Amino acid sequence: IVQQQNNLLRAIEAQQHLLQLTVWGIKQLQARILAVERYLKDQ
């Protein structure tokens, strides 16, 4: 059953990396929409 926990941990480690990748994307999109909003305002 310690084999189980080692696998429960491996699934959590995989989801930890997925979360960091989603955060990366959200930051990128936020910067891109901001640049567009500023462009339309400057015009």
């Binding site: 084999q3 189980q4 696998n7 429960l8 491996r10 699934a11 995989a14 989801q15 990396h17 997925l18 990748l21 990366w24 994307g25």
Partner: protein
């Protein structure tokens, strides 16, 4: 980092996560 690289890393991590969930779910059925 490129968005197509992002697509590649996401898909690999999801597949890996799914295969790990199957592993765990079977080691329970071997008992319960």
């Amino acid at each position: 980092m490129t968005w197509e690289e992002w697509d590649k890393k996401i898909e690999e991590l999801i597949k890996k996560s799914e295969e790990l969930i199957k592993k765990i779910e079977e080691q329970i059925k071997k008992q319960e």
